[PDB]
Amino acid sequence: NYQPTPEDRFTFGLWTVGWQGRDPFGDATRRALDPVESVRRLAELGAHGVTFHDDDLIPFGSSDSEREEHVKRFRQALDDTGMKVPMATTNLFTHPVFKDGGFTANDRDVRRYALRKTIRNIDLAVELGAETYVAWGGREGAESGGAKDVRDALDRMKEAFDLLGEYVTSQGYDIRFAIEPKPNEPRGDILLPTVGHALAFIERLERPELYGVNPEVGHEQMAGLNFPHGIAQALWAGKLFHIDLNGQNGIKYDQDLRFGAGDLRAAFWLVDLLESAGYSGPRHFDFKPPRTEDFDGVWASAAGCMRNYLILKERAAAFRADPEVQEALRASRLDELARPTAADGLQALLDDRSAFEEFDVDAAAARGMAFERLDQLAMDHLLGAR
Amino acid sequence: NYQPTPEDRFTFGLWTVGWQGRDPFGDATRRALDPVESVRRLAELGAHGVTFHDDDLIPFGSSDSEREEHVKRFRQALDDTGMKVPMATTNLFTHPVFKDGGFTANDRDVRRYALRKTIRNIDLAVELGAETYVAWGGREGAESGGAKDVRDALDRMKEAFDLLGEYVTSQGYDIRFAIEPKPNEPRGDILLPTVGHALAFIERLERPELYGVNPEVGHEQMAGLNFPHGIAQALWAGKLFHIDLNGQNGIKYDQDLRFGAGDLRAAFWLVDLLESAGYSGPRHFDFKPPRTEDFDGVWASAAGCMRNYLILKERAAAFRADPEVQEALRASRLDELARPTAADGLQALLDDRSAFEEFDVDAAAARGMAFERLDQLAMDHLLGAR
Ligand SMILES: [Ca+2]
Ligand SMILES: [Ca+2]
Ligand SMILES: [Cl-]
Ligand SMILES: [Cl-]
Ligand SMILES: [Cl-]
Ligand SMILES: [Cl-]
Ligand SMILES: [Kr]
Ligand SMILES: [Kr]
Ligand SMILES: [Kr]
Ligand SMILES: [Kr]
Ligand SMILES: [Mg+2]
Ligand SMILES: [Mg+2]
Numbered sequence: 001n002y003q004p005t006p007e008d009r010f011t012f013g014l015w016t017v018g019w020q021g022r023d024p025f026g027d028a029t030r031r032a033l034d035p036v037e038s039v040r041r042l043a044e045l046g047a048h049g050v051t052f053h054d055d056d057l058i059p060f061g062s063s064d065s066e067r068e069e070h071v072k073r074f075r076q077a078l079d080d081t082g083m084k085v086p087m088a089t090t091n092l093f094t095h096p097v098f099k100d101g102g103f104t105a106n107d108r109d110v111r112r113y114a115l116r117k118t119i120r121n122i123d124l125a126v127e128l129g130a131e132t133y134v135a136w137g138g139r140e141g142a143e144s145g146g147a148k149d150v151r152d153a154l155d156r157m158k159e160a161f162d163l164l165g166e167y168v169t170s171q172g173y174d175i176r177f178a179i180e181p182k183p184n185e186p187r188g189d190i191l192l193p194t195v196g197h198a199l200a201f202i203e204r205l206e207r208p209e210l211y212g213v214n215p216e217v218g219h220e221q222m223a224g225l226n227f228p229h230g231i232a233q234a235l236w237a238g239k240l241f242h243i244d245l246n247g248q249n250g251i252k253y254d255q256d257l258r259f260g261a262g263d264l265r266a267a268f269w270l271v272d273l274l275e276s277a278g279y280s281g282p283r284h285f286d287f288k289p290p291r292t293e294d295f296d297g298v299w300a301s302a303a304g305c306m307r308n309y310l311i312l313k314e315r316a317a318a319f320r321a322d323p324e325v326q327e328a329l330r331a332s333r334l335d336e337l338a339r340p341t342a343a344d345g346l347q348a349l350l351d352d353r354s355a356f357e358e359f360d361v362d363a364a365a366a367r368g369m370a371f372e373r374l375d376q377l378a379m380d381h382l383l384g385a386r
Numbered sequence: 387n388y389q390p391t392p393e394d395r396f397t398f399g400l401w402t403v404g405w406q407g408r409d410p411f412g413d414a415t416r417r418a419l420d421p422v423e424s425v426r427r428l429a430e431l432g433a434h435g436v437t438f439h440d441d442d443l444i445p446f447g448s449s450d451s452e453r454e455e456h457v458k459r460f461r462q463a464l465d466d467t468g469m470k471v472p473m474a475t476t477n478l479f480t481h482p483v484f485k486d487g488g489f490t491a492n493d494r495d496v497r498r499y500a501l502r503k504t505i506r507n508i509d510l511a512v513e514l515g516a517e518t519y520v521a522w523g524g525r526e527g528a529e530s531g532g533a534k535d536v537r538d539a540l541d542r543m544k545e546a547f548d549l550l551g552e553y554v555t556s557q558g559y560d561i562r563f564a565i566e567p568k569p570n571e572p573r574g575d576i577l578l579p580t581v582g583h584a585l586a587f588i589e590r591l592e593r594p595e596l597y598g599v600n601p602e603v604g605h606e607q608m609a610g611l612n613f614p615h616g617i618a619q620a621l622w623a624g625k626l627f628h629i630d631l632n633g634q635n636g637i638k639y640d641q642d643l644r645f646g647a648g649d650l651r652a653a654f655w656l657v658d659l660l661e662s663a664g665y666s667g668p669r670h671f672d673f674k675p676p677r678t679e680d681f682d683g684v685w686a687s688a689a690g691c692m693r694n695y696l697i698l699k700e701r702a703a704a705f706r707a708d709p710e711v712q713e714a715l716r717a718s719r720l721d722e723l724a725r726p727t728a729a730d731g732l733q734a735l736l737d738d739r740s741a742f743e744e745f746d747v748d749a750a751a752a753r754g755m756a757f758e759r760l761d762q763l764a765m766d767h768l769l770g771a772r
Binding site for chain 1: 481482483485486489490492493494495496497498499501502503505506527528529530531532533534535536537538539540541542545546549552553556569570575577578579580581582583584585586587589590608609610611612614615616618619621622623637651652654655658659663705715718719720722723724725726727728732735736738740741742745747748750751753755757758760761764
């Protein structure tokens, strides 16, 4: 049951199933995985495709010849299984040179290098068919207040993204950019910490239409925010270009648990929203099989990601299809929220005595919203207890 | 020492010093304050002005004659003291009619009422000299996932703000709007939860230039975010129209402690930023003298708000003026952060071998940022331990 197939558009980063298990207080527990093995094993599990940071595919410091060898064998695995590469990104956080950031490093020479490293990988991403190029500025930020002048840093971040937009436009590439927010970790505070901050920043870019967000479940939850609400705002703005799915148990270090784990109810409301809105992008998992696991546990956790999406999809569909739920939505006036407040116009509203002078505030206040019955029907559907 | 005077632009909400101390677990500990007394006492402490919600000044449900008497008395106190009213706002959260929101209530009749209530108070705020009209949508949101279709709610929120923009433009008013974010409380999750989300939302309004943010220290801190960073993004966007100052001790209920309390280092970096950026708006305190206090404690707490801003202003100015700090900023390359990354342009950057092939990544990585020395000089200045 709940068997994933390629048309579900489930994708995984090479760094996810390939995570060797090095955490903040521990050494690796698993050997490195060959990207070719990951492509084949994920295809066998029903995945649609894979994603990568430049340095996941090509060892940092590779010569052109070595680079070609690594890419060629990866492309052969893609050609053999029909696996796609819908998104790619740059590693601007592992190497010690990026200790104070890539695009917003205080050192100007580092900022220039970060852009050149990014541009090289945009070309490769385009060759492999990526539709979205993600940017996760994990080193952009500070541990102390005087270390980073944030207005200057935002000028530098805008400059970098504007140069990247000029580059893709000049080359005639159709690829678009997606900024992936995170509030903290590895930096004390990271710039553009939430979906909101990233959406706002994009509106200051020279070509805003080329940029959207790649929200990650766990990242918004690291700020204690409601992920489904943030995704609704990104959809409302026309900016949900991609999404990173995983689990997180509250406000703490970035867990990257398999999707479904962590906040289960939020996962249900997220899937309900993605399916009801008709999101058509990749269902990408950015997760880390816990370091307690061996390679069998790695594939069992990857399979669990997809399985939980599919179970939740079925429950959300059953919830929305239930006439008792549609009745409860009407009882809670969900449909009334879709009606314009004042399509009659400002003057009409001002002249409408029923909107103020003769408005029965006490009768309106006494009307229960019936949200608890609605939510218990949602709970019953999620648990299969109807 | 550190005596506030009117040109410091310190302002207070009537509801701050007037908070009777009622919380959900306890009854009022202080009698209601007459707004006239608050105006007089705040003026004696060196305040520049006061702000109000409609219902703080005019009891909800007041007749026209009652309304006129309350406004007349308040105007007389302002006239007598010279106190200004730079900002006002609407109470769209106390009355039970707003239990599911004002602008985004599921019930359409409540949304219309919320707009009429707001428009009535905009006229009064303009007459009293306000430059900014704040909106805190404290009831906009949900406790459960199915209760609110967030995309429809954002359509309704946009419609409401667009109608208010149409209204002030039709009347020829110069007043501007400021959205005050909060992530949660009183709702399980509130819409437009952070500075970022509000900034992004403003870019979808019909007349974006009329709207900015009114960020509150404690509210961004309720999401564990860096308040100075969020203020820097608002300044960078040209949207810091007003600000709410207070204290908060981490991730918990909204404390509204006096300014300086809570995260003291963040208060220092905030004042450093506001003064270095030349923010010219009100330094508004949205605080609650703890309910442990009597009226003497209310005025001591209000005085402490202003005193702490002035101490921090002195220490931030001494920090920035110190030649040893200017040297440390150079050692940490804060000056390089202000230089464009690639004003030579994209083609020059692509052709620059010093930015890629010939970039000595190990030499750059070996350079210490010297951020700890810089931060310890900041600590020494804040504590007067130089
Ligand atoms: Ca993560
Ligand atoms: Ca507050
Ligand atoms: Cl193991
Ligand atoms: Cl549910
Ligand atoms: Cl008392
Ligand atoms: Cl400090
Ligand atoms: Kr990027
Ligand atoms: Kr922004
Ligand atoms: Kr408003
Ligand atoms: Kr938005
Ligand atoms: Mg991610
Ligand atoms: Mg406030």
